[PDB]
């Protein structure tokens, strides 16, 4: 049958799209990935099978057993999750696929990635490639606002490299662990501090570099005007 | 009262978030931006006020409505925090002591359903606008060489954008794709090389999403 590649959002169940919610309530089977919040899953009454971490072959065998199935992925399925590969593989083996976009975690910090006088665009890059290798940061090194995903374990190397490539060592950066969940933890640090191995952060985390990080901070004191 | 800055999604009302939907159905007032789908607005029973288009005026107007209700919804297309001057709006409100809550949305950047990142092709992507606050032109240099580049508000100035990307060192043979009114019944997709674009050989009308890179030929 049919396969819906659905974005679950960053975690907060209210950030699911209406289409995703309806599909989850209605789906006979939901094949979910890693980083899918238990809150989102508890909304699904059908059979819940974990697929991820050879994933292709499993998707195929459930898609055949039903009229349609939902393949659930964190955030938006088409960025940094190999969603592209799953789509190809499923089409190549005669299975229709309909992508349902979602709120990507790149947009879960609430910060304006673009802002007048600070950044007129942004870039997003992975700290880990398919196969486990290191990313080539040159093409991204100087974009006003840089967002790094899957970059916690390698934060020191990534920072040293960005510093090599020319970013301001004093640049403010923000790490946001489990954005949109009750375990959300923001860690502020300057690039240089990250390169010196001084910042404690655990995955999964959103890593944002650039002056925008600082937009909503009070003037008279280090206070998050928007958090309060 | 409080101001909820809400992402309306790219157009399809089904791509609204549950939270956005809840707020829109209950808001006594909805201050909507431009390019917010007509089907999304029809869902809001409250007072609807078009608020967009200078930015100081919008602020003054946002502040006015905010003070006259327990809460109001400021509705923006896609996600409120990218390319919509959402940061300036939030900043203004905070400075005037108006509580603000940001509700993310499905950005038009992801409305084509295409993989912006893909094995061996692109390990990240960039997004830039062809029009800055004030109407000026973008310094494309920092974005010229990213594997997958997505350009918003780049339809009218496409020819110029293409040329700059070429002067900045990008490949003329690079495949690109234009997706007009993504997620709507009139969606339309136009293929074309960076070459044909710089040559004025491509016709696309706004609003459109402009994706550049090999991932364009993945599907
Ligand atoms: N709730 C969350 N908080 C912080 N980072 C998150 C997150 N959900 C996903 N991520 C980031 O995403 C990486 C997994 S790659 C999958 C990304 C997903 N397609 C999306 O659009 O968000 C993690 O290592 C982390 O960097
Ligand atoms: N349905 C749609 N199809 C194609 N492009 C769209 C679109 N809706 C918005 N856009 C793009 O967005 C530009 C407006 S700038 C506002 C972007 C919005 N914040 C978002 O996250 O999507 C347009 O010029 C166009 O390039």
- Contact call for residues B167 and B141 (beta carbons, < 8 A): no
CB-nearest partner of A17 from B87, B106, B139: B106
Q: How far is the CA of B31 from the centre of ligand 2 (A)?
A: 18
- Residues forming beta bridges with residue B211, ordered by sequence position: B150, B177
Catalytic residue among B12, B19, B25, B33: B33
- Contact call for residues B207 and B35 (beta carbons, < 8 A): yes
Q: How far is the CA of A55 from the centre of ligand 2 (A)?
A: 34
Rg from Cα positions in chain A: 19
Reported as type and span, the H/E element at residue B59 is helix B55-67
- DSSP structure string for A30-68: EEE-TT--HHHHTT--SEEEE-----HHHHHHHHHSSSE
**Residues of A with CB below 8 A from B124's CB?**
123-126, 135, 139-140
- Residue B148: closest CA among B216, B217, B212: B212
SS3 B47: strand
For A96, phi and psi rounded to 5 degrees? Answer: -65, 150
Edge to edge, the sheet with strand B124-129 lists A185-190, A172-177, A205-209, A145-149, A121-126, B124-129, B148-152, B208-212, B175-180, B188-193
Q: Where in chain B is the domain with CATH 3.30.950.10?
A: 108-219
Edge to edge, the sheet with strand B71-76 lists B47-50, B29-32, B71-76, B2-7, B100-103
> Six-digit token pair at A223?
């206070």
Which among A32, A35, A152, A201 is the best mutation to test ligand 1's pocket, defined by most ligand atoms within 8 Å of the CB? A35
Q: How far is the CA of B208 from the centre of ligand 2 (A)?
A: 7
- Contact call for residues A207 and A155 (beta carbons, < 8 A): yes
- Residues forming beta bridges with residue B183, ordered by sequence position: none
Residue A221: CB atoms within 10 A of its CB come to: 6
Would the CB atoms of B146 and A130 count as touching at under 8 Å? no
- Residue B81: closest CA among A149, A208, A142: A208
- DSSP structure string for chain A: -EEEEEE-BSS-GGGSBHHHHHHHHH-SEEEE-TT--HHHHTT--SEEEE-----HHHHHHHHHSSSEEEEEESB-TTSSS-HHHHHHHHHHTT--EEEE----GGG-S---SSBTTTBSEEEEEESS-TTS-----TTTTT-SEEEEES-STTHHHHHHHHHHTT--TT-EEEEEETTTSTT-EEEEEEHHHHHTT-----SSEEEEESGGGGTTB-SSSS-BTTT-
- Contact call for residues A16 and A102 (beta carbons, < 8 A): yes
Would the CB atoms of A15 and B19 count as touching at under 8 Å? yes
Q: How far is the CA of B10 from the centre of ligand 2 (A)?
A: 7
> Six-digit token pair at A164?
């090599």
- Residues forming beta bridges with residue B84, ordered by sequence position: none
Does the domain formed by A1-104 have CATH 3.30.200.20?
no
CA distances from B4 to A35, A110, B99, B208 (A): 27, 12, 9, 26
Q: Which atom of ligand 1 is nearest to the CA of A149?
A: 26
Tally of CA atoms within 13 A in the half-sphere of B89 that contains its CB = 35
- Residues forming beta bridges with residue B101, ordered by sequence position: B4
Q: Which atom of ligand 1 is nearest to the CA of A10?
A: 1
Whose atoms come closest to the Cα of B75: which ligand? Answer: 2
Rounded Cα distance between B216 and B214, Å, is 5
CA distance B125 to chain A (A): 5
CB-nearest partner of B142 from A78, A108, A144: A144
Rounded Cα distance between B72 and B79, Å, is 17
Active site residues of A: 33, 53, 150
Q: Where in chain A is the domain with CATH 3.30.950.10?
A: 105-228
Would the CB atoms of B87 and A114 count as touching at under 8 Å? yes
Q: Where in chain A is the domain with CATH 3.40.1010.10?
A: 1-104
Q: Which atom of ligand 1 is nearest to the CA of A150?
A: 24
From the annotation, which residues of A make up the binding site? 10, 76, 104-105, 150, 179, 205
CATH class belonging to A105-228? alpha beta
Is residue B10 marked as binding? yes
Whose atoms come closest to the Cα of A107: which ligand? Answer: 1
Rounded Cα distance between B208 and B181, Å, is 6
Rounded Cα distance between B102 and B114, Å, is 26
Would the CB atoms of B115 and A144 count as touching at under 8 Å? no
Rounded Cα distance between A37 and B216, Å, is 31
Q: Where in chain B is the domain with CATH 3.40.1010.10?
A: 1-107
Verify whether residue B171 is a known catalytic residue. no
CB-nearest partner of B81 from A99, A113, A120: A113
CB-nearest partner of A110 from B102, B110, B147: B102
**Residues of B with CB below 8 A from A113's CB?**
81-82
The experimental method, as deposited, was: X-ray
Q: How far is the CA of A194 from the centre of ligand 1 (A)?
A: 20
Rounded Cα distance between B81 and A95, Å, is 36
Rounded Cα distance between B19 and B184, Å, is 21
CA distances from B181 to A7, A125, B3 (A): 21, 27, 28
- Contact call for residues B150 and B165 (beta carbons, < 8 A): no
> Six-digit token pair at B31?
């201050």
Rounded Cα distance between B177 and B67, Å, is 44
Does the domain formed by B1-107 have CATH 3.30.470.20?
no
B13 to chain A: nearest residue by CA? A18
CATH architecture of the domain B108-219 equals: 2-Layer Sandwich (3.30)
């Amino acid at each position: 049958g049919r396969v819906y590649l659905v974005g679950a959002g960053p975690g907060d169940p209210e950030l699911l799209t209406l289409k995703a919610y309806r599909l989850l309530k209605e789906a006979p089977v939901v094949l979910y990935d890693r980083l899918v919040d238990e809150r989102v899953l508890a909304l699904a009454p059908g059979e819940k099978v974990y697929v991820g971490k050879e994933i292709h072959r499993l998707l195929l065998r459930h898609a055949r057993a039903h009229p349609f199935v939902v393949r659930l992925k964190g955030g938006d399925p088409m960025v940094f999750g190999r969603g592209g590969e799953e789509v190809l593989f499923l089409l190549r083996h005669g299975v229709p696929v309909e992508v349902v976009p979602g709120v990507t975690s790149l947009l879960a910090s609430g910060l304006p990635l673009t802002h007048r006088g600070l950044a007129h665009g942004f870039a997003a890059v992975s700290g880990v490639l398919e196969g486990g290798g290191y990313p080539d940061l040159r093409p991204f090194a100087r974009v006003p606002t840089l967002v790094v995903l899957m970059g916690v374990g390698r934060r020191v190397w990534i920072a040293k490299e960005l510093l090599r490539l020319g970013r301001d060592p004093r640049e403010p950066t923000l790490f946001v662990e489990r954005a949109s969940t009750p375990k959300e933890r923001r860690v502020h640090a300057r690039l240089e501090e990250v390169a010196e191995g001084k910042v404690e952060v655990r995955p999964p985390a959103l890593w944002i570099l650039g002056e925008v990080v600082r937009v909503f901070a009070e003037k008279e004191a280090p206070v998050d005007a928007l958090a309060l």
